[PDB]
Every structure is written in structure tokens, then in C-alpha cells.
Structure 1
Amino acid sequence: AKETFYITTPIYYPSGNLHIGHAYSTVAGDVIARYKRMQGYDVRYLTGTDEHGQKIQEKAQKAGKTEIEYLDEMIAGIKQLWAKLEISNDDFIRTTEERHKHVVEQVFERLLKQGDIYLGEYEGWYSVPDETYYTESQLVDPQYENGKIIGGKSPDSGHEVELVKEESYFFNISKYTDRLLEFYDQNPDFIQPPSRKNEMINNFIKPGLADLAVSRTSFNWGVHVPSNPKHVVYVWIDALVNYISALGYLSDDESLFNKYWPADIHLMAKEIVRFHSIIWPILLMALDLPLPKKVFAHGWILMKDGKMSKSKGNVVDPNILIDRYGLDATRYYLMRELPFGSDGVFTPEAFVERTNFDLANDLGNLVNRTISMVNKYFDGELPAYQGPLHELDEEMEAMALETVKSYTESMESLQFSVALSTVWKFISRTNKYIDETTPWVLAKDDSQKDMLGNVMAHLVENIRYAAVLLRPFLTHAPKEIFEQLNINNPQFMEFSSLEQYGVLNESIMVTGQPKPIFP
């Protein structure tokens, strides 16, 4: 009955402590998941960790530990953070799990048996921090010896590349290039935003897709090729397979795979779009599998000196923000302050401005002001909604419905900051409604009691709209708001209860001890 929806985050390298950039992607994925569940979809939400390759082996070495004991410590920390952020992921995939490694072995042996993979020699350059191959001409700031280039830097990051010349299996991705372009034409929405698509076509596809080195013999940390055990599978081939291996693809139970694949959305930042939009669909074509419906690439959290990066160390730890300011404030800031298609700067001043003014004052004090007035003027018994009796009610009831409509448009196109600011236009206007109607003036005249009850009904109904719309974003405050107002019919917390204004048509006893909803 329920249509499926499958959403993934990238599997992040546990090469250091995760920062708010990683929290952004995972909270954004969590917001989409929660939103889609509330729309009545059968949702599966995957996240995980990319634990193989030269980068990880070098951090394990640097920590004075074996790879596996290093990894088990780091993953414990990452699992706690997602529990702390109240991420509603249905599974956590580790590339060191046997269920993943089995699939990587099978995929590689299949393509090798098909003849799509062949043995040869790679000669070129490699950035370990980017896990990316480069040609001589791609190098930034080359170092010359006696005419020959003997070093230089990655054009993506500026990290020092290293020389590689070794035996390596190759994947002939150039033969699929006509089909990939045809797929781009049949599916125009595939790469979001539109700007990254032109970036893919003109800087990778049009110049000519080189044959991809899919294995290496110079290090041991990764999945080994069963037919040639000296070879370790290239970390990006290993990693990309997590999205289907986590669904039991090529195992004795492919039920999740049959149900949820193809993925509806792959989330990521812009730097890994080429892996997910060129290499990934080509790998799927070679396995005769359906392609994902969409890859969404958001911008970066920026610092004083560019991209926030854990290898670099210009970082903000999400554990600090949650421990000090609370969960709702951290989730709210990330989704509100970074527009999806833009690179945004973190500042601690903007964080506390959002935490104090938007949450605690705008929303928090609206709920507190409202419950205080019902307690004073009606002794806790909220009067039932009747209709738009006040002169402002017709236009404000229309605004509530236009708010839900605009919110929906923003959520479907993943514009989370615009969705949130639309909700805050409505919250701000509800505070303004108290100031326009002046209930204290109405409470003096006992002929104006019906109008006073009407005003209170509109305040609580506006609050209910806001609380339902914020359920995908904030995990505590909506529940607290429903508790304090004493709305316990589960239907009135759902999206379908926002279609027609004024669902509270019985009198309700609100809380007599109204506390602040935000830490």
C-alpha cells in the first residue's frame, strides 16, 4: 500500500572526529526521512562509515594502533553522536562488516568474469587525503627536477599528491559514456542543483573518461580480490557499494534490495558528486541494476579559512553545541542557517541569535503567553473553536493554509531554510495577533467573552500548525507543546490535520504549570 522511499547519507571516513558539516548532512537526511514518514511513505534511511583505504590506515598508524581497534573506538563515538542527534536511521553500515565485504568481492569477481575489468598498469598521481587519481597536467604548483615533474598538489584540495606506478585492475568506464549521457537526457532532475550537472559534463565527461584503476597492490587495508589476493579494491568502488550491500544485494536475502532499490535520494556535499553521478551509475549499468533517481549535493559549512575539514582542523564539534545549548537548538541552526545550494559561514554569534530569538523567544514565549492567558481568563479551560469571528481571522486562517502550501513546496525541493523561515513568518504573525486583538482589553468587558474565547482558540490552533510542521526538524519541542496544550488525539499531530483550520472544537484543559519548552 505505502510507496517506498530510500534515502542515504555518504559513508563518512572515520579519519578524525566528525564536525558540524557531517552533522548537517545527517540531520538533513533525517529531516527528509521524518518528513516522508509523516507523508505516509515506507521510509528506509541509511548512514555509515567508509573504513578502508590508505587514508584510514594512515590515521590508525598515526594513532599507534591497528586499523580495527582504531576503527571500533571511532565508530563507537560516531554511533553515540547520531543517538545524541536523534537520527532516525534504520541501519548503520560499516565497510569492515562481512555482509559488505562479501558484496564487494562478488561485484569485483562478476565484472572480472564479464571482462569489464582487466589487469594492467597504472602510472600517474594519487592524493591519499582525497583518495583520487590525477594526471600530470591536473597538478597544481608542480615541482620540476631536471625537466620532469616529480611532485605537486591536488587541484581539488591543495594536498600533496604522490607518484604511483604499479600493477592495477582497470574498469573500462569509457564504453558506458554514451549511455550515461542518454540517461542524463532522459532524467533531467538527476543531479541537484542544476549547476553541478554542467560541472560534471564539461569538466569530466566531455574531455574524455579515462579507464578507472579499480584496484591496487601497494597497501593491504581493504577488500582483497579473491582471484588475485595481492590486489586491494579501490576505496571508492568499495564505498559506493554500501548503498546496495546494506539492502542484502547478492546475499541469501535480497528482500530489502527488491523493495527499496533504486534509491530516491543520495545526499552529499559537492566534492563527491563525480563519484555518485559518473562512476556510480556506470557501475550499476555494468551490474544491470536500476540507477538512483536523484543525487543531491549541498554546499559547505565555511569557517574563517574556507571549507570546514577534519583533516585541516578548523572545526566545530556538535557534542559541544548539544551539551551546552541543547538538541533542538543544534538541529534548528544547521537547517535554518545553511541554505542547501549555498556555502554558509559558521559564527557562534549567529548560533546564539537563532537559539535565543527564534526558538526561546519567538516560539517558546508565544506558547507561554498563550497558556498564561487561558489560565488567567478561562481558568485553564480553552474554549472550543467555532469560526473566524474576529475581523482578522479570515485572513489569518488563509495564511495558515498558505504557510502549509509554501512549506510543502520548499520541503519537496529540499529548501529547508526557506521552509523554516516560512514557519517563522507564521509564528511571528501569531505573536502580532496577540498585540492586534489585545485580549486583556476584551477580558474587561463581559459582553466580549465569546470574542475572547475565539482569540484564544486561534492562538492555540496557530501554535498547533507550527508544532506539526516542526516535527521533522525538532525532536523535543513539538512533543512538549502538545503535552502542555493537552492535545492527545494522535490525528491532530499529523500533516492531514492541517488541511482544514480549527480542529479543536471541544473545550480542553491546558497545563496549569506552564514551563519554558526550550533549554
Structure 2
Amino acid sequence: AKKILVTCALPYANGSIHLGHMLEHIQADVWVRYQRMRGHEVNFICADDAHGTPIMLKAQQLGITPEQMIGEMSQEHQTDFAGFNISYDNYHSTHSEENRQLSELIYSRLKENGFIKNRTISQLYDPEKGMFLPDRFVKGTCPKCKSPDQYGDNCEVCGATYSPTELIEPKSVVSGATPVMRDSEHFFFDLPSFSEMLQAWTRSGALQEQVANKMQEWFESGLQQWDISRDAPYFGFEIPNAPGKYFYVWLDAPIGYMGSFKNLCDKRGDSVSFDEYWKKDSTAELYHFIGKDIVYFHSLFWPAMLEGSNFRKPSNLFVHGYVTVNGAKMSKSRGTFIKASTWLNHFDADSLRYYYTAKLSSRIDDIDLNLEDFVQRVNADIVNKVVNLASRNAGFINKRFDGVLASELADPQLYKTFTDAAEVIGEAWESREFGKAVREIMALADLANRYVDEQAPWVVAKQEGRDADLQAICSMGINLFRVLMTYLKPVLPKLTERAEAFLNTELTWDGIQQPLLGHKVNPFKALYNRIDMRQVEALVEASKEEV
């Protein structure tokens, strides 16, 4: 019995969920469902990251309050995640009372502990709109090639990089007014003070090898103080005792993990679990599933923030690579930039969950969704290997034996081979070696289908006096199916439900030790149908048209 708190990165509230995000939530959900199957106390937590200048400016363009826009995006996001059956125990928001109080608390403790410094800096300022401008909101003519209408610190024409201050005839993307340098006091988090603490953390062998290596690069470059304040106008949390100053979104974002859990506890009327999970001497486990582009925040700023505020640190960080479609970054022009909602119009959630899982590993490598291979893998593995085991045998049981399975296993040894694999497959799920688990499961499926081929029930069915043998053979195939679906339960939630309805039994990890004997099963409509390239073409075409 373990206590585990698992999170996925908090998606920004200024964009729709796409297949890239889904890889992250699907990987976490499979791990979480497996942990639940092994009987642990699990708390799967997430929320929308709703602060920041971009969000503030978007709402303004749309002519609505940031609170209205984020509210709409929060519902959109949760609807999509629900469509893919991501089993969160709570989905909250960084813009909440819980996060506000927790953000103020942590800040106050850090300051109290001498980890916050004051410093004045110079930055481009929009005198017309009356707001400091982040680089991406400063446009002008490239100093090098002189190309007009360039944004940020780089020219999309000659590719040169430079400070926005170097842009010729600068202009605010907000008002179009000419920007100017202006001073401002900022608050900094003294990350450098936790250097040794962080280095030991990196060196423990807990973090993924590739992540540890990455961190060594950052220590080499040298840690610096982190600017965690932003001036009004800004959509975020105001800094105590600092009128007109707000916490930079990345400061309150990870605290959102804590805010979402506190929210869950308070809603449950649970007054002891928050401290049991976050206090320094906690015996519970904390895990964050994140993409490799936000590792700096989670491996350096985050642990240091918790340490300096007297809270426990993450047990581990689980980093994943990026999703590519047909081998390349999603392309809007090619119709490979696919939204989660769009996907569900063409395929079911189980298909993508399975494809991603078959390709996932414990490393940070990229995951490629090759659409052609997708159709082939789904049809060959789900339809032809696993579901086939049920469909080719259920008919005889229902029509010839009134849905009743044999009183004994026809091949006890073969069944033992299947149950004997639970240890290694469970370890594969546990260690996040999803690709390994799937290969082992499909290897078993091949064995099961070979067994059925060897017995040839379609032949036995037409031989008089072989009734008892037919029931024995078909019952055996169905029990092998029972075991396989148990191993795949964390992966295919819906197919699993349809499987449990047919089998008249909930599938539990330990349950496979007791095969279904003299047991009534129910007839069933198609458990899973084949898909085809025409559907893929439709998906791509729709995606092209949507942008």
C-alpha cells in the first residue's frame, strides 16, 4: 500500500489540446491505471496554467475578461481529456484561491529565509499602452539584412539573432507605438544558493540518465538568480507588500500542483492528506510527468523553491520526448497538426492510446505517429490478435453451449505460461517500459492464436460427437483473452469495459490466477472494428481545413 501523487504538466489556457499534449496525458494515465490495479492509493492531479501576458492580451483582443476566456478553455480542455479517458482525480486551475494562498506562503517563506533579492532592470516599454514589452511583442526592421516586420530577437529572413533593442524603427505589437527603455524594480529567487543541493539530487541516479546529463550542462553554464516578478498590467497574483508587482507565471505554475491537490482535499473534507503528502517528512511519493522543454523549471527552480519553503521535493521527474506525425513536427499546412477534439471525430481514444503505448519507453526520445503504420498496427494487434481471440470463440459458446464456459481448462500449462508473465509485464508498466510490455503481451497473443489454429475449432465444429471438445477449445481461447485484456486494461479503458461486459466479470490483476470455469458469458456486438487509410485521409483533410 503506497500513497502516490501523480501530475501532468498544467496546459496553457491559450490554446487547444493537440496530439502532442495527449502523448503526455496518455503516458501518465496508463501508469496511473496500472498503479491503481496494484492496489495503491493514487491521486492523479492536473489543472490549466492560466496566467501570463499572452493570456491577458488574448482575452483583450477577443473583447472578454481573461477570466471568461480561461473559463471557456478550462471546459474545452477537460472535455477533450475526458474524451480520451484520462482519469484525473482532480483538474483545477492556477488561477484559484488555493494557488494564490500557496503562492503567497511559499514566497513569504523564501523571503523570510533570505532567498529573495531586489534589483532594478531596464526593459522596452510601451508608453502608449503603458506596459513593459516581452521580446515577442516588439517588432521592427532587422539590423542585419534590413527586412521589415520582424518579431522578437530573431529575423525570419536572414535568421540572425539580436536583442529587440537592436531592431530598426521598433514598434509595439500591442499599440504600434514606438517603445523606449524604462527602469523597474524586480524580485529574484536566489537559485544559486541551492546549487550543491541540486547537484547531489541530479547525481543520485533517480532522474533519467539523459536528464541528468542535461542538468550537468546547466550547472556548467552556471546557475543565475531568477526574475520572478512582472509589472502591471498583468494577469496573475499580486506580490504581497509590492503594489503594481505580480508573480511571474512560472513561479505560480508548479505551485498549481499543490493548489490542485489542496482543492481536492478540501472538496473531500479531508484535513490531513495535504500535509501527509507535502510535509518534509512525507512517506508518500510525488511524480511529475513533463515534456523535455520544461525540465529546467521542474528540476532546478521547483525543488529549490520547495526546499526553501520547508516542503518535500519530487520523488522523481518522468520526462518524455516530442510527438511527430509522419516523421516530422506537426505541420498545419500538411494537415498533421491535429487537435484532440478533431481526432475523436475520426477515431476512438483507445486506438491512439494503444499506438503511443506500443512506442513509449523510459527514455526521452521522440515518438512518431506514422499514420500508415497506425492503421496497420491497430488492425494487426487489437483487431486481429487480441479481439480475434474472443470473436473467433464466443460464437460457438453462445450458440452451441448457451454461453457457458467449460468446467476445466483444456491446456493448464499454456494458461500457466500466460499468468507467469504477469511479473515481467507488470514491471514493464511500472518502469515505464511500455514498448516492452506491449511486445510481451502481443507475443502471448501470437501464442494464443497459434493454440486456436492448432485445435482448429472450425474443423471440430463439424465433426459429430466432438461437442465437449469444441466447448473446451473455445473456452480456453476466451480465458487467454481474459488474461490479455487484464494486461492491457491500463491501456484500453473502453475496450476493457466492453470485454468485462462480455465476460461478466471485472478484470483485476490478481484475478487471472482464477480462470473462468462453468461461467456464463454474454453475447456481444463487435468489440473492435478495423480502420482504414480512407479515414486517415479524412482526418488530415479536416485538419488542413481547420487552420
Q: Name the TM tier (shorter chain).
A: 0.7 to 0.9
Matched, 1:8 2:7: yes
Separation in 2, partners of 1:164, 1:269 = 35
For 2:311, the equivalent position in structure 1 comes to 289
Closer/same/farther in 2, CA of residues 471 and 144 from structure 1, 3 Å limit: closer
Which of the numbers 453, 456, 461 marks the counterpart of 2:474? 456
Give 1:437-452 correspondences, 5 Å limit: 437-443=455-461, 451-452=469-470
Closer/same/farther in 2, CA of residues 379 and 246 from structure 1, 3 Å limit: closer
Closer/same/farther in 2, CA of residues 164 and 273 from structure 1, 3 Å limit: farther
Matched, 1:79 2:78: yes
How far did 1:509 drift?
A: 2.9
Separation in 2, partners of 1:54, 1:345 = 33
Matched, 1:518 2:528: yes
For 2:449, the equivalent position in structure 1 comes to 431
Aligned AA (1:77): E
For 2:214, the equivalent position in structure 1 comes to 199
1:476 aligns to what SS in structure 2?
Answer: helix
Report if the CA contact (8 A) 1:4-1:259 is conserved.
no
Q: Deviations over 1:272-300 (max 9, x none)?
A: 11111111111011012211110000011
Separation in 1, partners of 2:464, 2:369 = 52
Of the structure 1 ranges 421-430 and 437-446, higher mean CA displacement relative to structure 2 is found in 437-446
Closer/same/farther in 2, CA of residues 438 and 253 from structure 1, 3 Å limit: closer
Closer/same/farther in 2, CA of residues 255 and 481 from structure 1, 3 Å limit: same
Closer/same/farther in 2, CA of residues 516 and 198 from structure 1, 3 Å limit: same
Aligned AA (2:2): E
Report if the CA contact (8 A) 2:353-2:491 is conserved.
yes
For 1:158, the equivalent position in structure 2 comes to none
Matched, 1:40 2:39: yes
Separation in 1, partners of 2:321, 2:467 = 53
How far did 1:38 drift?
A: 1.0
For 1:154, the equivalent position in structure 2 comes to none
How far did 1:30 drift?
A: 1.6
How far did 1:104 drift?
A: 1.1
1:363 aligns to what SS in structure 2?
Answer: helix
TM-score after normalising by structure 1: 0.84
Report if the CA contact (8 A) 1:109-1:227 is conserved.
no
How far did 1:495 drift?
A: 0.6
Aligned AA (1:407): I
Gaps of 5+ in 2: 125-133, 138-151, 169-179, 279-283, 530-547
Separation in 2, partners of 1:107, 1:177 = 19
Report if the CA contact (8 A) 1:166-1:218 is conserved.
no
Report if the CA contact (8 A) 1:45-1:91 is conserved.
yes
For 1:159, the equivalent position in structure 2 comes to none
Matched, 1:380 2:400: no
Separation in 1, partners of 2:249, 2:80 = 25
Separation in 2, partners of 1:253, 1:497 = 32
For 1:155, the equivalent position in structure 2 comes to none
Separation in 1, partners of 2:301, 2:254 = 9
Closer/same/farther in 2, CA of residues 461 and 329 from structure 1, 3 Å limit: same
How far did 1:221 drift?
A: 1.4
For 1:411, the equivalent position in structure 2 comes to 429
Separation in 1, partners of 2:254, 2:373 = 36
Separation in 2, partners of 1:164, 1:410 = 56
Q: Name the Cα RMSD after superposition.
A: 3.2
For 2:114, the equivalent position in structure 1 comes to 115
Gaps of 5+ in 1: 152-161
How far did 1:170 drift?
A: 0.9
For 1:345, the equivalent position in structure 2 comes to 368
Report if the CA contact (8 A) 1:8-1:267 is conserved.
yes
Of the structure 1 ranges 299-308 and 210-219, higher mean CA displacement relative to structure 2 is found in 299-308
Report if the CA contact (8 A) 2:45-2:261 is conserved.
no
2:313 aligns to what SS in structure 1?
Answer: coil
Of the structure 1 ranges 117-126 and 430-439, higher mean CA displacement relative to structure 2 is found in 117-126
For 1:65, the equivalent position in structure 2 comes to 64
Aligned AA (2:438): L
Give 1:6-405 correspondences, 5 Å limit: 6-122=5-121, 141-143=160-162, 166-185=184-203, 187-189=204-206, 191-192=207-208, 194-202=209-217, 204-217=218-231, 219-248=233-262, 255-261=272-278, 263-303=285-325, 306-308=328-330, 315-339=337-361, 341=363, 342-386=365-409, 388=411, 394=413, 396-405=414-423
Aligned AA (1:200): M
Q: Deviations over 1:210-235 (max 9, x none)?
A: 11111122542111102102111111
Separation in 1, partners of 2:303, 2:335 = 33
| Identity %, equivalent residues | 26
TM-score after normalising by structure 2: 0.80
For 2:500, the equivalent position in structure 1 comes to 482
Aligned AA (2:236): G
Q: Deviations over 1:183-206 (max 9, x none)?
A: 333x321x22x112111122x112
2:243 aligns to what SS in structure 1?
Answer: strand
For 2:516, the equivalent position in structure 1 comes to 504
Aligned AA (1:76): Q
- The count of aligned residue pairs is 481
Aligned AA (1:45): F
Report if the CA contact (8 A) 1:118-1:170 is conserved.
yes
Aligned AA (2:247): V
How far did 1:339 drift?
A: 4.3
Separation in 1, partners of 2:326, 2:352 = 20
Separation in 1, partners of 2:337, 2:387 = 30
How far did 1:338 drift?
A: 4.5
Report if the CA contact (8 A) 2:110-2:305 is conserved.
no
